[PDB]
Amino acid sequence: PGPYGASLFQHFLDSYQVMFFTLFALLAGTAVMIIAYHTVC
Amino acid sequence: ATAVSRPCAGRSRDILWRVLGWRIVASIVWSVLFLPICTTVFIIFSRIDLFHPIQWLSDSFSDLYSSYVIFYFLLLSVVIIIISIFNVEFYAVVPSIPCSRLALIGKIIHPQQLMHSFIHAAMGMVMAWCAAVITQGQYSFLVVPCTGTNSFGSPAAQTCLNEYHLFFLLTGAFMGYSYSLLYFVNNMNYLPFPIIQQYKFLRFRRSLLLLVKHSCVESLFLVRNFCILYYFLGYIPKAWISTAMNLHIDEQVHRPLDTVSGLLNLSLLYHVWLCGVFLLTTWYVSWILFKIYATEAHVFPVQPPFAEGSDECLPKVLNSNPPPIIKYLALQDLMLLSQYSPSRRQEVFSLSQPGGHPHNWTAISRECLNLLNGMTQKLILYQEAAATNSVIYSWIQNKREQIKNFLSKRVLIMYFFSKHPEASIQAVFSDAQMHIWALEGLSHLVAASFTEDRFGVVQTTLPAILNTLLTLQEAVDKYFKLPHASSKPPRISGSLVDTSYKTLRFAFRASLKTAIYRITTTFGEHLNAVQASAEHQKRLQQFLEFKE
Amino acid sequence: CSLGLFPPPPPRGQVTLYEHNNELVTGSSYLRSEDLIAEFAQVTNWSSCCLRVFAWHPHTNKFAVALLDDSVRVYNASSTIVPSLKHRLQRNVASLAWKPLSASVLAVACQSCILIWTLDPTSLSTRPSSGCAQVLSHPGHTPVTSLAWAPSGGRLLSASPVDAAIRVWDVSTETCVPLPWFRGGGVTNLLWSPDGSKILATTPSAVFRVWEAQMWTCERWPTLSGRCQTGCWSPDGSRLLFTVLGEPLIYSLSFPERCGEGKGCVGGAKSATIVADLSETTIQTPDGEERLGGEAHSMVWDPSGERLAVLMKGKPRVQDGKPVILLFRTRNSPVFELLPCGIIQGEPGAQPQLITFHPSFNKGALLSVGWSTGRIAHIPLYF
3-class SS letters over B223-291: HHHHHHHHHHHCHHHHHHHHHHHCCECCCCCCCCCCCHHHHCCHHHHHHHHHHHHHHHHHHHHHHHHHH
Burial grade of B525 (CB within 10 A; 0-12, 13-18, 19 or more) = exposed
Hey, CA dihedral for B126, B128, B133, B137, is it positive or negative? negative
Query: What is the arrangement of strands in the sheet containing C352-357, beginning at the earlier edge strand?
Result: C23-27, C15-20, C376-382, C365-371, C352-357
Q: What span, in angstroms and rounded, lies between the C-alpha atoms of C30 and C27?
A: 8
Burial track B129-150 (b if 16+ CB lie within 10 A, e otherwise): bbbbbbbeeebbbbebeeeeee
Helix then strand then coil, in percent of chain A rounded to 5, is 60, 0, 40
Element (H, E) at B296: none
Secondary structure of residue C322 in the 3-state scheme = coil
Query: What is the arrangement of strands in the sheet containing C84-85, beginning at the earlier edge strand?
Result: C51-56, C62-67, C72-76, C84-85
Strands C84-85 and C95-98: unpaired
Burial track B66-77 (b if 16+ CB lie within 10 A, e otherwise): bebbebbbebbb
Residue among C243, C366, C363, C249 nearest C302 (CA): C366
Binary contact (C214, B336; C-beta < 8 A):
yes
**Strand blocks (E) in B68-196:** 143-145, 159-161
Element (H, E) at C336: none
Hey, CA dihedral for C9, C11, C14, C18, is it positive or negative? negative
Residue among C132, C128, C138 nearest C163 (CA): C138
How is residue B526 annotated by DSSP? Answer: G
Q: Which residues pair with B100 in a beta bridge?
A: B419
Residue among C364, C230, C239, C246 nearest C298 (CA): C230
Compute the half-sphere exposure of residue C221: CA atoms within 13 Å on the CB side of its CA: 27
Q: What span, in angstroms and rounded, lies between the C-alpha atoms of B443 and B465?
A: 9
Hey, CA dihedral for C294, C300, C305, C308, is it positive or negative? negative
Q: What span, in angstroms and rounded, lies between the C-alpha atoms of B343 and B362?
A: 18
Q: Residues before each break in chain A (C–N > 2.5 Å)? A: none
Binary contact (B341, C258; C-beta < 8 A):
yes
Chain A: residue nearest B141 by CA?
Answer: A3
Q: What span, in angstroms and rounded, lies between the C-alpha atoms of B293 and B200?
A: 8
Is residue C344 a contact partner of residue C328, using CB atoms and an 8 Å limit? no
Using a CB-CB cut-off of 8 Å, the residues of chain B touching A38 are: 18, 308-309
Q: What span, in angstroms and rounded, lies between the C-alpha atoms of C282 and C285?
A: 10
Residue among B91, B88, B19, B10 nearest B314 (CA): B19
Q: Which subunits have 3 or more CB–CB pairs within 8 Å of chain C?
A: B
Q: Which contacts (CB < 8 Å, 24+ apart) does range B307-315 have?
A: B308/A38, B308/A39, B309/A38, B309/A39, B310/A39, B311/A39, B311/A40, B311/B11, B311/B15, B312/A39, B312/A40, B312/A41, B312/B18, B314/B364, B315/B359, B315/B360, B315/B363, B315/B364
Least CB-CB distance to A7: which of B71, B85, B311?
B71
**Is the CB of residue B493 less than 8 Å away from at least one CB of chain C?**
yes
Q: What span, in angstroms and rounded, lies between the C-alpha atoms of B298 and C381?
A: 47
Using a CB-CB cut-off of 8 Å, the residues of chain B touching A39 are: 15, 18, 308-312
Strands C376-382 and C365-371: antiparallel
Burial track B369-391 (b if 16+ CB lie within 10 A, e otherwise): bebbeebbeebeebeeeeeeeee
**In sequence order, what DSSP letters do the residues of C136-184 get, joined into one string?**
E--TT--S--EEEE-TTSS-EEEE-TT-SEEEEEETTTTEEEEEE-SSS
**Strand blocks (E) in B308-378:** none
Least CB-CB distance to B500: which of C60, C173, C217?
C173
Q: What span, in angstroms and rounded, lies between the C-alpha atoms of C372 and C44?
A: 10
Centre a 10 Å sphere on the Cβ of residue B51 and count the other Cβ atoms it contains. Answer: 6
Query: What is the arrangement of strands in the sheet containing C249-254, beginning at the earlier edge strand?
Result: C228-233, C239-244, C249-254, C273-277
Q: What span, in angstroms and rounded, lies between the C-alpha atoms of B243 and B247?
A: 7
Alpha helices in chain C (DSSP H): 33-40
**Shortest alpha-carbon distance between residue C317 and chain B (Å):** 49
Q: What span, in angstroms and rounded, lies between the C-alpha atoms of A9 and C39?
A: 68
Element (H, E) at C69: none
C2: left (phi over 0), alpha (psi -120 to 50) or beta: beta
How is residue B419 annotated by DSSP? Answer: B
Is residue B60 a contact partner of residue B47, using CB atoms and an 8 Å limit? yes
Q: What span, in angstroms and rounded, lies between the C-alpha atoms of C153 and C170?
A: 10
Hey, CA dihedral for B340, B342, B347, B351, is it positive or negative? positive
- How far is C-alpha B161 from the geometric centre of its chain's CA atoms? 40
Secondary structure of residue C199 in the 3-state scheme = strand
Cis peptide, bond prior to residue C143, ω within 30 of zero:
yes
Binary contact (B199, C215; C-beta < 8 A):
yes
Using a CB-CB cut-off of 8 Å, the residues of chain C touching B195 are: 155, 168, 170, 173, 175, 177
Using a CB-CB cut-off of 8 Å, the residues of chain A touching B314 are: none
Q: What span, in angstroms and rounded, lies between the C-alpha atoms of B96 and C171?
A: 25
Backbone angles phi, psi at B547, to 5 degrees: -110, 5
Q: What span, in angstroms and rounded, lies between the C-alpha atoms of B314 and B304?
A: 9
Cα distance from N-terminal residue to C-terminal residue, chain A? 54
* CA angle (B140 as vertex; B135, B141 as ends), nearest 5: 150
Strands C281-285 and C218-221: unpaired
Binary contact (B136, A33; C-beta < 8 A):
no
Q: What span, in angstroms and rounded, lies between the C-alpha atoms of C201 and C191?
A: 7
Burial grade of B392 (CB within 10 A; 0-12, 13-18, 19 or more) = exposed
Q: What span, in angstroms and rounded, lies between the C-alpha atoms of C312 and C282?
A: 15
**The 3-state secondary structure of C21-66, one letter per residue:** CCEEEEECCCCCHHHHHHHHCCCCCCCCCCEEEEEECCCCCEEEEE
Cα distance from N-terminal residue to C-terminal residue, chain C? 22
Cis peptide, bond prior to residue B354, ω within 30 of zero:
yes
**In sequence order, what DSSP letters do the residues of B107-138 get, joined into one string?**
HHTSHHHHHHHHHHHHHHHHHHHHHHHHT-GG
Is residue B503 a contact partner of residue C174, using CB atoms and an 8 Å limit? yes
Beta-carbon contacts of C337 under 8 Å, excluding residues fewer than 6 positions away, are C330, C331
Q: What span, in angstroms and rounded, lies between the C-alpha atoms of A41 and A33?
A: 12
Q: What span, in angstroms and rounded, lies between the C-alpha atoms of B358 and B351?
A: 4
Hey, CA dihedral for B413, B419, B420, B421, is it positive or negative? negative
Q: What span, in angstroms and rounded, lies between the C-alpha atoms of C368 and B240?
A: 85
Burial grade of C148 (CB within 10 A; 0-12, 13-18, 19 or more) = buried
User: Dmax of chain C from CA atoms?
Assistant: 61
Is residue B514 a contact partner of residue C59, using CB atoms and an 8 Å limit? no
Least CB-CB distance to A8: which of B16, B68, B312?
B68
Using a CB-CB cut-off of 8 Å, the residues of chain A touching B21 are: 33-34, 36
- How far is C-alpha B83 from the geometric centre of its chain's CA atoms? 14
Backbone angles phi, psi at C312, to 5 degrees: -80, 145
Q: What span, in angstroms and rounded, lies between the C-alpha atoms of C327 and C340?
A: 7
* CA angle (B385 as vertex; B379, B386 as ends), nearest 5: 90
Query: What is the arrangement of strands in the sheet containing C105-109, beginning at the earlier edge strand?
Result: C95-98, C105-109, C114-118, C133-136
**The 3-state secondary structure of B359-376, one letter per residue:** HHHHHHHHHHHHHHHHHH
Beta-carbon contacts of B515 under 8 Å, excluding residues fewer than 6 positions away, are B439, B440, B442, B443, B469
Chain B: residue nearest A6 by CA?
Answer: B68
**Is the CB of residue B513 less than 8 Å away from at least one CB of chain C?**
yes
- How far is C-alpha B355 from the geometric centre of its chain's CA atoms? 45
Q: What span, in angstroms and rounded, lies between the C-alpha atoms of C98 and B135?
A: 60
Question: What single-letter amino acid sits at C64?
Answer: A
Centre a 10 Å sphere on the Cβ of residue C150 and count the other Cβ atoms it contains. Answer: 17
Q: What span, in angstroms and rounded, lies between the C-alpha atoms of B535 and C314?
A: 58
Task: Kindly list the distances between the CA atom of residue B167 and the CA atoms of B219, B237, B239, B256, B258, in Å, as whole numbers in the listed order.
Answer: 15, 10, 13, 11, 10
Task: Kindly list the distances between the CA atom of residue B290 and the CA atoms of B74, B85, B210, in Å, as whole numbers in the listed order.
Answer: 21, 10, 17
CB pairs under 8 A between A and B: 87
Binary contact (B308, A39; C-beta < 8 A):
yes
Is residue C344 a contact partner of residue C327, using CB atoms and an 8 Å limit? yes
Is residue A24 a contact partner of residue B296, using CB atoms and an 8 Å limit? no
Burial grade of A8 (CB within 10 A; 0-12, 13-18, 19 or more) = middle
Q: What span, in angstroms and rounded, lies between the C-alpha atoms of B340 and C58?
A: 22
**Is the CB of residue C122 less than 8 Å away from at least one CB of chain B?**
yes
- Residues B246, B247, B251, B252: what is their CA dihedral angle, to the nearest 10 degrees? 130
Q: Which residues pair with C233 in a beta bridge?
A: C240
Is residue C381 a contact partner of residue C18, using CB atoms and an 8 Å limit? yes
Q: What span, in angstroms and rounded, lies between the C-alpha atoms of B378 and B425?
A: 12
Helix then strand then coil, in percent of chain C rounded to 5, is 5, 45, 50
Q: What span, in angstroms and rounded, lies between the C-alpha atoms of C229 and C60?
A: 29
C54: left (phi over 0), alpha (psi -120 to 50) or beta: beta
CB pairs under 8 A between B and C: 75
Beta-carbon contacts of C358 under 8 Å, excluding residues fewer than 6 positions away, are C56, C365, C366, C367, C368, C378
Q: What span, in angstroms and rounded, lies between the C-alpha atoms of B318 and B532?
A: 28
Element (H, E) at C15: strand C15-20
Task: Kindly list the distances between the CA atom of residue B223 and the CA atoms of A6, B42, B76, B211, C354, in Å, as whole numbers in the listed order.
Answer: 29, 17, 21, 18, 61
Question: What single-letter amino acid sits at B69?
Answer: V
Chain B: residue nearest A4 by CA?
Answer: B68
- How far is C-alpha B320 from the geometric centre of its chain's CA atoms? 25
